[PDB]
Amino acid sequence: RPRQYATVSKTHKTVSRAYGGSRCANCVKERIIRAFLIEEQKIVKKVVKEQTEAAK
Amino acid sequence: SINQKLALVIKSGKYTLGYKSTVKSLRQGKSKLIIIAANTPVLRKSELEYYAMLSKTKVYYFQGGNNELGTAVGKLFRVGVVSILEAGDSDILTTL
Amino acid sequence: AREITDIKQFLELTRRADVKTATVKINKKLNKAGKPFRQTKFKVRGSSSLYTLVINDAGKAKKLIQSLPPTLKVNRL
Amino acid sequence: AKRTKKVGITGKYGVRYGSSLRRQVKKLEIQQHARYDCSFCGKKTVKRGAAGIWTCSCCKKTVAGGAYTVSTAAAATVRSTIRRLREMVEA
Amino acid sequence: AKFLKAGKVAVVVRGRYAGKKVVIVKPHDEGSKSHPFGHALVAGIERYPLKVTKKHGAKKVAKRTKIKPFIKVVNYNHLLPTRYTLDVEAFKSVVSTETFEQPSQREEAKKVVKKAFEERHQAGKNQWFFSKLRF
Amino acid sequence: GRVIRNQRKGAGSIFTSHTRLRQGAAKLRTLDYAERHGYIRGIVKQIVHDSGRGAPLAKVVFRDPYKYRLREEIFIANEGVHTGQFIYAGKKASLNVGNVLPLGSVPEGTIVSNVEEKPGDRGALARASGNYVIIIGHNPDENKTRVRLPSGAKKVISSDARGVIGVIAGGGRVDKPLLKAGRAFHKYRLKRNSWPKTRGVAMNPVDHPHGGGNHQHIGKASTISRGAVSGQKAGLIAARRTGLLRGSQKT
RNA sequence: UUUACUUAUUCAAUGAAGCGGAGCUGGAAUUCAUUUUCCACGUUCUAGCAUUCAAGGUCCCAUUCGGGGCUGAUCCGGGUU
RNA sequence: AGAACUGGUACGGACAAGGGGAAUCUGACUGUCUAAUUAAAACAUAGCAUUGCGAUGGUCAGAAAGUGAUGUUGACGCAAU
RNA sequence: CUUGUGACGGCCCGUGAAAAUCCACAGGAAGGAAUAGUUUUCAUGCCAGGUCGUACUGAUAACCGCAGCAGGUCUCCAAGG
RNA sequence: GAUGGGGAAGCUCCGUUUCAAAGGCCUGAUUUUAUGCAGGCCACCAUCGAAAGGGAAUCCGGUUAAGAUUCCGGAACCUGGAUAUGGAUUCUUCACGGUAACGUAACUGAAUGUGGAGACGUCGGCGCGAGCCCUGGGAGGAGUUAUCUUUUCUUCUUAACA
Ligand SMILES: [Zn+2]
Ligand SMILES: [Zn+2]
């Protein structure tokens, strides 16, 4: 129960990972991949936009 | 057509299905081509696009579903992805 | 109300300096039919918990009481 | 074996409520209890939770739709004509 | 074409160092004996260096450009690669399987990469790598 | 005589709608800056049954551009939306399902729902299951749009008036029977105390204007003037014709 | 009888946030002389993330631990719409 | 489940525990009511049909009111029959 | 047998309370070392924990029915054949 | 159901976040001192409302003429607040091991934001557990006994908490 969560120490409450005791580890994986992929996509989109409109 | 060439590859060439074996082959560089079903996750799709960008392998997007591609290769289950390692007989690598 | 096995842990416990009381229980026991042994139980009492050093050797038991302090108020039973 | 000639799922309703209403209910109960295909994963794990809540257990998704079927034909027409005019407008 | 080459940048997704950016230095692509699978020795960051401005005079600057790096054996399936690259001369010698199973060797490897990372970051280089992956 | 049922339903002690199991109102986000200068993205996070309604709702999430928070909204789901979906809403948005383009922007022949009546009422028209509004034509000079409403009604409303694209979900609902006073019980007990309906002609004349008589008969004709009063307006009110209609709505 | 003005009255929102005008910066406009006016005037494969008067640039200070102003974010009118 | 043997043919041994059939009238059903003379063929019911209403509104309320119920609603809906 | 729970399954035009409280996570403000500090989510040790109720019946005699009225009045436990 | 506000001859009515200037924090600066004061944050918008909903924390034994989870003995738990020793970390300043799932005695973390528990139907059968019931042997006690009954009955228990 919640007050018992307040009794116990950290080891019993979360995990040593980023997003320890909030999100599933597989979801952590998924969203990390999503971040990296779409920011790379953003970058290539930005540069193709810049160069085509620089030609134009 | 494309399903006919893919059956030819099933008979002559060789391949591996599914994300895990596919990306393993792609890490090893042993693959040449991928066909990817439209229905499968855009994340998985984009990740494979990145992997194949690194490997310089070729990619093709299948006008169908995991079911359709499975029927094409001649198997009876879901296939979101297939990796062609070599065809031998087919014009797959040449066309598209 | 915690088991204890480490004897030097029990000794520094006796000198934890909140400890004031101690007890030694004897128990008639059975390992086997023909050697019903004598279990010794050193139950030491301080503030927040009682620590029970368990023993099944009378030689070690005697040695322990020889090692203990005299001022720690004991109860033999 | 073969249980029922023509009442099917409407034999739990027994001898009540009139044959015609039992027919209509039969049709729609079949539609609403049936399993459908999640477009995303092609699998047959789609079911109604509630009226116009059609969720897929395998791919953990939910789509809004008809109370008894998952894609109503009106909305199909709407999808098609939307794609039509949208293609035209971007064109 | 394989690309798990020993100068690479990759993105650790699974484990205590997840969501991190490591550099790949020693790929055992064709398996091993103790970690028998497609695996590597890599190294990266455990605590990124913070953003820095003009406002900081030297003390916050040093404190913020500190690094806590790490080394790790990992499965390629538990890695994500990139296209980016990095220079690997300063530690490709000291790093090895024998650098592991000896925490004295570990700490020494951590000491030099810190120096090897701090200067390449103190130089305005590899900004994408020394940055953070937010998510 | 005596006060009668509608004449008590006004006061509304036991006739108030029931609210315990509703997620609050379903409404369109405020026409603040972006939806009238551009667009904004939101994520359909989940879809949920609302009790007493017949349609489902969409728990959608936007981001307040002025403050670091996530502002949540409850929309009505059209057929074709789903979870984890990107809903773009505003003026410079795209003509797909879920989006909230203005009626000034959409073309003729278009389908919309949850349509506003004046910009900043945040969802009035065609909010129920399977009900859609069709566009007819514009008068952009003096910006107005003609729309056909499920009653067949050709209304004229402004152009900045937003409206969601698609057909409202949960259609076909009344195609099914109920078969059971219990099914109807459950329906109306989550909506409001509105059932069973008992007949005035079976009541006593104190209790209704039909009640009484040795035979259950109305006696005096049930077509009631609109300019009648509170106590007389039992029956068919302001009616133009009665009986079985054979032919066409003729509009 | 028709319509015009907003301020009176009335309606509705809103934590009263991006009103209006003019203007850059581009596209079209035919400019018949210089612009005549019109469009935009940072976002759409993906269930990520976006916060610390913003980083930068720039001018000062009392350099020191750091502190402050302009821009970054056009200007005017203070009619919330 | 079955077979021998047995009994003053008794044996679901007490307790417990459906009377049925052929037809009519009537209401479809389950359900609810006249507490303390009427439980019914009455009410309800699902289903059928009609009527009003596009929110500056319909129905209803309130001494009024910057008041209110339907309405955390919007014609597959609310209201009245 | 009574019960408690776990995963499953069926039903719904019905999908079956809220708030307090607590915890983690993201974030990286602030501060921290070498003879030092750092942390009081590790162990151990110290003090204090107020207010009001608290007996009994709970019914063919403790309640309401003018009463020591064959009435009525919410619930838990529930052996053997 | 107050206040603000509006109604009402008026007793009072509406309405409960609304057309309101509806406030109270963290930080340091004053270490003449107040809390003025440098700073920035935020934005309930009263309150009342369940001895069956939610809820921080206790159990056994014994005890009285009449009390008991309340008393006595023993063993525990939480909350709040001071708090010191030990331990861990660190000269690479804010731990390490594990491929991973994750593990440990601990092992910085403000503003703000995100998520979760609280927090949840009903019925079916299935499994699992608790207590009970049935029961075997053995150790004690009691009963029956013209006859027969290695017999019928009975005690053989172990709480919170760690
Ligand atoms: Zn998860
Ligand atoms: Zn699916």
Inspect the interface and report whether the beta carbons of E80 and A33 lie closer than 8 Å: yes
Residue F39, CB, strand H, below 7 Å: no
Residue F81, CB, strand H, below 7 Å: no
Inspect the interface and report whether the beta carbons of E14 and A16 lie closer than 8 Å: no
Cα distances from F230 to residues B41, F122, F198, F227, F235, in angstroms, run 62, 33, 19, 10, 12
Chain G positions within 7 A of any protein Cβ atom are 12-15, 17-19, 41, 43-51, 55-58, 64-67, 81
Q: Which 8-state DSSP code applies to residue C76?
A: B
By the 10 Å C-beta count (0-12 exposed, 13-18 middle, 19+ buried), F27 is classed as middle
**Whether F249 contacts F153, CB under 8 Å:** no
F63: closest CA among F49, F73, F55, F74? F73
**Whether E24 contacts E8, CB under 8 Å:** yes
Cα distances from F98 to residues D26, F75, F94, F114, in angstroms, run 33, 10, 10, 11
CB hemisphere CA count around E125 (13 angstroms): 11
d(CA A24, CA C50): 41
Amino acid at C24: V
d(CA D77, CA D72): 9
Interface membership of A23 toward E (CB under 8 Å) = no
Contacts (Cβ under 8 Å, ≥6 apart) of E46: E17, E20, E68, E69, E70
d(CA B35, CA B61): 6
| Residue of chain B with shortest Cα separation from E30 | B28
**Whether F206 contacts F231, CB under 8 Å:** no
Give the tokens for residue B13. 């060439």
Interior angle at CA C29, CA C25 and CA C30, nearest 5: 165
d(CA D55, CA F82): 9
**Whether F209 contacts F200, CB under 8 Å:** yes
By the 10 Å C-beta count (0-12 exposed, 13-18 middle, 19+ buried), B31 is classed as buried
d(CA B32, CA B30): 7
d(CA D86, CA D4): 50
Give the tokens for residue A10. 């950290």
Give the tokens for residue C1. 């109300």
d(CA F13, CA F36): 42
Interior angle at CA F121, CA F120 and CA F127, nearest 5: 135
Backbone angles phi and psi of C74, in degrees to 5: -105, 160
Interrupted after residues, chain A (C–N over 2.5 Å): none
Looking at the CA of D56, which ligand is closest? 2
F97: closest CA among F110, F221, A3, C41? F110
Cα distances from F29 to residues A17, F63, F90, F115, F123, in angstroms, run 37, 11, 10, 12, 9
Give the tokens for residue F74. 């409850």
**Whether B48 contacts B22, CB under 8 Å:** yes
By the 10 Å C-beta count (0-12 exposed, 13-18 middle, 19+ buried), E64 is classed as middle
Residue in B50, B53, B54 to test binding to A, most A beta-carbons within 10 Å: B50
d(CA A51, CA A44): 11
User: Using CA of residue F58, residue F62, residue F64, residue F70, what is the dihedral sign?
Assistant: positive
Inspect the interface and report whether the beta carbons of B50 and A40 lie closer than 8 Å: yes
- DSSP SS3 for D77: helix
Interior angle at CA C14, CA C13 and CA C20, nearest 5: 120
Cα distances from E30 to residues B19, B28, E26, E38, E97, in angstroms, run 20, 9, 12, 6, 15
**Whether F81 contacts D62, CB under 8 Å:** no
Q: Where are the alpha helices (DSSP H) in chain A?
A: 2-7, 25-55
